[PDB]
Design an enzyme around this catalytic site. Structure first.
Site, mmCIF file in Angstrom:
data_model
loop_
_atom_site.group_PDB
_atom_site.id
_atom_site.type_symbol
_atom_site.label_atom_id
_atom_site.label_comp_id
_atom_site.label_asym_id
_atom_site.label_seq_id
_atom_site.Cartn_x
_atom_site.Cartn_y
_atom_site.Cartn_z
ATOM 1 N N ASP A 141 9.329 -2.655 -12.758
ATOM 2 C CA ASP A 141 8.522 -1.701 -12.018
ATOM 3 C C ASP A 141 7.957 -2.299 -10.735
ATOM 4 O O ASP A 141 6.946 -3.009 -10.776
ATOM 5 C CB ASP A 141 7.382 -1.231 -12.899
ATOM 6 C CG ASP A 141 6.504 -0.210 -12.232
ATOM 7 O OD1 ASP A 141 6.887 0.339 -11.186
ATOM 8 O OD2 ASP A 141 5.414 0.040 -12.781
ATOM 9 N N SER B 229 9.249 5.020 6.570
ATOM 10 C CA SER B 229 10.531 5.632 6.918
ATOM 11 C C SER B 229 10.400 6.300 8.282
ATOM 12 O O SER B 229 9.323 6.819 8.643
ATOM 13 C CB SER B 229 10.961 6.654 5.866
ATOM 14 O OG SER B 229 12.087 7.400 6.295
#
EC number: 3.4.23.22
Length: 330
Positions: A35, A199
């Site tokens: 994770d 992004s």
């Protein structure tokens, strides 16, 4: 040194991935959920409340010649989905795909919430976010990656998740045969303890790329892709019959639909998520209504590039002094 381990989807929907990890001496092999959005390595154990264990393999410290109780230490964590676990702490030898760390904090669960109990396939979590999120008290402990770093050939690990298939976690090297073209690297902020990046924009299907900054985290421990409501609405508007359902808890669509791809930007590079990756299947057994793999982050407080996004790429987690993230197509 390096390590290389295969990671396997726990079910037909790629809900999560499990990776075998060797703990203790002689080795006890547990299947952990790697994770990158948390920083605790915790396991079902011989100390876990008996009624809260249902089919999981457990770690038994008393059978390990290298286990030592970290006297006085406790841990307690809550995850984004509301699940939780807590307990005490051992140090022991931990190996992942041939890479061995001595003195790793192995957090032994005394209590786990229902979601963990109900998932017989996951024996615990191995956190790979930054150690500043580790929940051990009074003294915070280091992640497997943190501990391994000085031993690694290169201070990196990579995530190569499969769509309906196994993939790979590598430590200490970049497998130049595992991706196509080049890796595009982008800056990381560690301010919140996550592999947080920005992004450069998105496109829906064959639409034009919209240039816009989207701050988010690369999180292997989250199933879906969670993005701003504006972005998510623009996507589902292109799917006939799609709508947001408060009762189901997200966007749904007719299972017969053909889904458009979703493109996200990494600098001047582009990663394309095929439409099929965005189909998470019937909302309930036998339904002709399907659940979307792209959902709104509104109410989460952070955008999350979860497995739906990450499995479309080869992803480099660069833990150099100045960390970065790299993305390649594959």
């Amino acid at each position: 040194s390096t390590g290389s381990a295969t990671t396997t989807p726990i079910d037909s929907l790629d809900d999560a991935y499990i990776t075998p990890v060797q703990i203790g001496t002689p080795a006890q092999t547990l299947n952990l959920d790697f994770d990158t959005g948390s920083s605790d390595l915790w396991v079902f154990s011989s100390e876990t409340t008996a009624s809260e264990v249902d089919g999981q393999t457990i770690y038994t410290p008393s059978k390990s010649t290298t286990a030592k109780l970290l006297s006085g230490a406790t841990w307690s964590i809550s995850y984004g989905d509301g699940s939780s676990s807590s307990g005490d702490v051992y140090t022991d030898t931990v190996s992942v795909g041939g890479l061995t760390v001595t003195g790793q904090a192995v957090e032994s669960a005394k209590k786990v919430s229902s979601s963990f109990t109900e998932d017989s396939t996951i024996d615990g979590l191995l956190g790979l976010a930054f150690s500043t999120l580790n929940t051990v008290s009074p003294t915070q402990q280091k992640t497997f990656f943190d501990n391994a770093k000085a031993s690694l050939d290169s201070p990196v690990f990579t995530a190569d998740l499969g769509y309906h298939a196994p993939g790979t976690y590598n430590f200490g090297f970049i497998d130049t045969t595992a991706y196509t073209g080049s890796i595009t690297y982008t800056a990381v902020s560690t301010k919140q303890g996550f592999w947080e990046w920005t992004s450069t924009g998105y496109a829906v299907g064959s639409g034009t790329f919209k240039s816009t900054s989207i701050d988010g985290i690369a999180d292997t421990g989250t199933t879906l892709l969670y993005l701003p409501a504006t972005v998510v609405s623009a996507y589902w508007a292109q799917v006939s019959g799609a709508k947001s359902s408060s009762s189901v808890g997200g966007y749904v669509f007719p299972c017969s639909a053909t889904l458009p791809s979703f493109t996200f930007g990494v600098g001047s590079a582009r990663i394309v998520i095929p439409g099929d990756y965005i189909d998470f299947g019937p909302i309930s057994t036998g339904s002709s209504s399907c659940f979307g793999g792209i959902q709104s982050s509104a109410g989460i407080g952070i955008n999350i590039f979860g497995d739906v996004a990450l499995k479309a790429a080869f992803v480099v987690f660069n833990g150099a002094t100045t960390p970065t993230l790299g993305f390649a197509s594959k």
